[PDB]
Design a protein around this nucleic acid. Structure first.
Length: 77
DNA sequence: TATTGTTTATTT
DNA sequence: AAATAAACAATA
């Protein structure tokens, strides 16, 4: 459609993988509960444990700049 | 139907 | 200038 999406931050990068894991082990589980539990877990994670994901987001961000150099975030009502 | 981090938009 | 609001990325 032409709309350029926001880069995934570290929490989104981690959430994708962990949501997939919870889905594989515990299917038939509602997405709101999964988000609540993922938020709690992420808040418990040590900063160092978060390093791979943070950097990964940054990597994606760099790619975003290369793919859409004229891009700026524009939230609209 | 919810979550965190990031950015812009709005109100103070 | 600074506190607050609000949009939004992936996903069942």
């Amino acid at each position: 459609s032409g709309h350029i999406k926001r880069p995934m931050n570290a929490f989104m990068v981690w959430s994708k993988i962990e949501r997939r894991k919870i889905m594989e082990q515990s299917p038939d589980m509602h997405n709101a509960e999964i988000s609540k539990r993922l938020g709690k877990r992420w808040k418990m994670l040590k900063d160092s444990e978060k390093i791979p994901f943070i950097r990964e987001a940054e990597r994606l961000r760099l790619k975003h700049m290369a793919d859409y150099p004229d891009y700026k975030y524009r939230p609209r009502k």
